[PDB]
Ligand binder design. Sequence first.
Ligand SMILES: [Mg+2]
Ligand SMILES: [Mg+2]
Ligand SMILES: [Mg+2]
Ligand SMILES: [Mg+2]
Ligand SMILES: [Mg+2]
Ligand SMILES: [Mg+2]
Ligand SMILES: [Mg+2]
Ligand SMILES: [Mg+2]
Ligand SMILES: [Mg+2]
Ligand SMILES: [Mg+2]
Ligand SMILES: [Mg+2]
Ligand SMILES: [Mg+2]
Ligand SMILES: [Mg+2]
Ligand SMILES: [Mg+2]
Ligand SMILES: [Mg+2]
Ligand SMILES: [Mg+2]
Ligand SMILES: [Mg+2]
Ligand SMILES: [Mg+2]
Ligand SMILES: [Mg+2]
Ligand SMILES: [Mg+2]
Ligand SMILES: [Mg+2]
Ligand SMILES: [Mg+2]
Ligand SMILES: [Mg+2]
Ligand SMILES: [Mg+2]
Ligand SMILES: [Mg+2]
Ligand SMILES: [Mg+2]
Ligand SMILES: [Mg+2]
Ligand SMILES: [Mg+2]
Ligand SMILES: [Mg+2]
Ligand SMILES: [Mg+2]
Ligand SMILES: [Mg+2]
Ligand SMILES: [Zn+2]
Lengths: 138, 56, 336
Amino acid sequence: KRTVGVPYRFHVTPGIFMNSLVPVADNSGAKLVRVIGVVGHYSKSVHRRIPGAGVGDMVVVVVREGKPELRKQIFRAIVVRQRRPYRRPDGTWVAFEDNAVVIVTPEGDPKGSEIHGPVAMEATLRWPTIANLASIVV
Amino acid sequence: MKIHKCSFCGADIPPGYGIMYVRSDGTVQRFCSRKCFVSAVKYGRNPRKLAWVRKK
Amino acid sequence: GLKINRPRRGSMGVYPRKRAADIVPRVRTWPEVNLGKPTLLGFAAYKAGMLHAVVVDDRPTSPLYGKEVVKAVTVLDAPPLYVAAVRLYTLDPTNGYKVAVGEAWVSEPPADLRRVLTLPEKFDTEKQLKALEEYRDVAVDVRVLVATQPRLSGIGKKTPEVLEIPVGGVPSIDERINFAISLLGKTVSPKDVFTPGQLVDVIAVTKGKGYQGVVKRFGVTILPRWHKHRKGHRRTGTIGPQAPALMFTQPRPGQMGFHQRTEYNKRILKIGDNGAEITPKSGFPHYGVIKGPYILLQGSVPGARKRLVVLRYPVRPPKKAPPAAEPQVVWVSSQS
RNA sequence: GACGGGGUUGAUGGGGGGGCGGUGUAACCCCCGAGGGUUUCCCGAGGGGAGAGCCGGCCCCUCCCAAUCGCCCGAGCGUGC
RNA sequence: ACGUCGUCUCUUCCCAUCCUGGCGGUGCAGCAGCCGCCAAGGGUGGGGCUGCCCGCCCAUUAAAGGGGAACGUGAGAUGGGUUCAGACCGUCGCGAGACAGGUCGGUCUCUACCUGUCGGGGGCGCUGGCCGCCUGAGGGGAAGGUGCCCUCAGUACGAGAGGAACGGGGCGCCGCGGCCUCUAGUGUACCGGUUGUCCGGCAGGGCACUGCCGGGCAGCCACGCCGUGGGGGAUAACCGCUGAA
RNA sequence: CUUAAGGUAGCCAAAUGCCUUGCCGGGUAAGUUCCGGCGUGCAUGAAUGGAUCAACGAGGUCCCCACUGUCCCGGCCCGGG
RNA sequence: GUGAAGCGGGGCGAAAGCCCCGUGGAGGCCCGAAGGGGUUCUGAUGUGCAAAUCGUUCCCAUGACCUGGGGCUAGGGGCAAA
Ligand SMILES: [Mg+2]
Ligand SMILES: [Mg+2]
Ligand SMILES: [Mg+2]
Ligand SMILES: [Mg+2]
Ligand SMILES: [Mg+2]
Ligand SMILES: [Mg+2]
Ligand SMILES: [Mg+2]
Ligand SMILES: [Mg+2]
Ligand SMILES: [Mg+2]
Ligand SMILES: [Mg+2]
Ligand SMILES: [Mg+2]
Ligand SMILES: [Mg+2]
Ligand SMILES: [Mg+2]
Ligand SMILES: [Mg+2]
Ligand SMILES: [Mg+2]
Ligand SMILES: [Mg+2]
Ligand SMILES: [Mg+2]
Ligand SMILES: [Mg+2]
Ligand SMILES: [Mg+2]
Ligand SMILES: [Mg+2]
Ligand SMILES: [Mg+2]
Ligand SMILES: [Mg+2]
Ligand SMILES: [Mg+2]
Ligand SMILES: [Mg+2]
Ligand SMILES: [Mg+2]
Ligand SMILES: [Mg+2]
Ligand SMILES: [Mg+2]
Ligand SMILES: [Mg+2]
Ligand SMILES: [Mg+2]
Ligand SMILES: [Mg+2]
Ligand SMILES: [Mg+2]
Ligand SMILES: [Zn+2]
């Protein structure tokens, strides 16, 4: 059975939303993607509210710039960096320079073989496969 | 209960204050206040050129 | 009905949202607790301000167990209470109403109490205790009338507050009545009522915000594409169908704020004795300084920065009991 | 409107002192200053040191000033079942 | 002379129930599915296309139910369509003209009298006046709703493939009620920088409607933090015990 | 037969195509609109002007980048009411 | 602001001819004040400032241009870039 992440997902302020343009942090071929959905129990919203995702969340993306074969296909990605500041459960406030996602399978397996740049711990702790490829964890 | 120093002004940051900022290359910085954070990042000021940093 | 489903804007459980009749909370429910000895079931203090403390998590199942977590805390300036009277209660046989059957007062009430009570020059406690004892067989509740001592707080005002606090902790009404009699004219410190680490309920009147619009009072949405709408945008479009007419569930502008609210299960972090250890070097903003005992609460409390807050034993406590040891507060933000 | 606190047995608002804080280093003084001219005791954007300066619809202390003088409301009685 | 479609905003009601609770049947092994019954407390969302309603589609989701309220709601909005006067096309007409065929443009008046609703005040009454503290007839409430992960367990079931449940632990999302310690926003209190001009220059200042730019206390505020439960009874659909006629 | 002749060059689901959200491509995750094609075109067509867009447009429409309080989702502030 | 015809110099050239720079100052030319007009917000107003206004955003702005005074055309008639 595949390695278990943490059973908890503390509240995070969402940084990316529907129709956001987010660069990719890996070498899977995609360069830029458009966010078109959020997956999981936290994805349900109310009237007029646009769903959002924070670090560690899984979203549905469409490849906009990248390899010609990969373009216009629908994938799943994990948010690993977020410009929107957010407060960890121990009261620590965090902010990154840039937004970024990692393209993964629906089960959480990364597409590319290497992740560029730093990765939020909440991404690493919820998805152990992402932890195995992240060189820097903050 | 580990006390960090501001990346801009050099002051000590008591727990529960300021933000920890991650640069795009993976370097982690801590800023005691929005004043230091906009000075270091948004405006790119030199801490040696500011009197209030030197006289801190 | 609606074109798109969504919950109603704001609660109707707080209808009517009128100004509270009293600036002091009037607690309706008091729990039945078994502490192995007689004790007051509550306490009253003044809200001083908020800080944040580094607290070591003590929940073994929590994902932050062992770690240090920053939590927002509320400081309550809690000078001791003065017991002035002991009131006995009984059940009315005709309807089952709880009715006061008499009371006994301390012989020499303090001079501050004369600012709110038309008292005689000298009470006679022995007759009143004697007359009270005839109702010992029909007594069902005993409460003490306490008066706050605001001169010992950071507010420094002189007019005190008076409220009944029941005696509990043991099932024996007879044993309860003796303990209440033993407190006449004495004082009760917060440590006598509570132990640090336990959960309490807080009841207080919230901060007044005056007359407010429907967008703030009920959380109704501003009209989308706001500039397009004639006659304003900080409003609901329609105020009802043709039938029924203007209902009581329609959001309207009115008083916001100054209401009595109750909040459950706030953990006591610390019950200190000297206020200098917790007061900031600048003083509490808009309050002052704490010189006597204080209570440290985890989280927020209703009311403004001088309101009198009532702490009681919880009525809806959680299933799993919180840990027996006192919580470890590593550091408070008012300290250096 | 109301509500709450104080009203001289008083710290209720102001003044003065202190605390904490915001900005960012005032005036004066000393050094440097690209280059020019009364050649070098002059002009000169500007830089450094010491000093910060200004300010607070916040907290403490202190009766120095003002919470005064005053103006009103208010039950009281009979009757029968 | 009752303002003509749709949409926005906001409130409530029905149940002929889409999910959430309970129960049964099955051509119900498990995973799933289909069918019926009780049940209206809560939920029922975000987008693309079209003026739409409707309908189709996209990625999610526990599910993304349907209806009534003067086809709820224009003295609340909007004005895309329809459905005035201008104009073009096709068709019809000798002609002026016509088309519920298409197309482009085309004034949305009113200081709220009464009632209602929401909040705020004054008086009288409460069997002489008053002060303080209580009770609780009744009234309001959704104050909560609902998901996910680990374990159970790769276990039960099964030829395999595949693949549960109860119970235990952890956390969210939506709603509600609070709060301002942190972070964010603002902050025409305040401090600094600087442009043009005027006050003879420096200093200090007026004006450029804070001249503009940067920071920013308090206060407010959310994008931040805190709280937000189980139980009892009688019951529905029904499942049983004893038990005669 | 025909009221004489029987729509040529062209152009099209057109501001002209009812059926019709026509059929095929492009564009979007998803396109009743739009663009390029196809044309026994209800009911296109030649000074009744056909085709035709260089320049010009307060003409009508579709798309891309930039930008943003349009919106997610509201908050604070200033002057006048 | 642009820079038509016309006019000078330079370079290349087998002659022809080509290229580059300058001068020149045309146009129902362009941007844009005054002036004229009247598009948007379907803004404000809508018992108005006003029985047609105001803000904002806009169009033209050397000409079929804007404007004063005087004059002519009159009702089944005038006048009409309609
Ligand atoms: Mg709220
Ligand atoms: Mg309008
Ligand atoms: Mg009418
Ligand atoms: Mg039924
Ligand atoms: Mg009608
Ligand atoms: Mg209607
Ligand atoms: Mg109307
Ligand atoms: Mg109406
Ligand atoms: Mg229209
Ligand atoms: Mg029409
Ligand atoms: Mg004809
Ligand atoms: Mg039209
Ligand atoms: Mg009105
Ligand atoms: Mg009125
Ligand atoms: Mg500013
Ligand atoms: Mg000067
Ligand atoms: Mg002047
Ligand atoms: Mg000015
Ligand atoms: Mg042909
Ligand atoms: Mg053509
Ligand atoms: Mg078309
Ligand atoms: Mg055709
Ligand atoms: Mg023809
Ligand atoms: Mg024609
Ligand atoms: Mg024809
Ligand atoms: Mg033609
Ligand atoms: Mg011109
Ligand atoms: Mg219009
Ligand atoms: Mg208008
Ligand atoms: Mg008006
Ligand atoms: Mg022009
Ligand atoms: Zn700093």
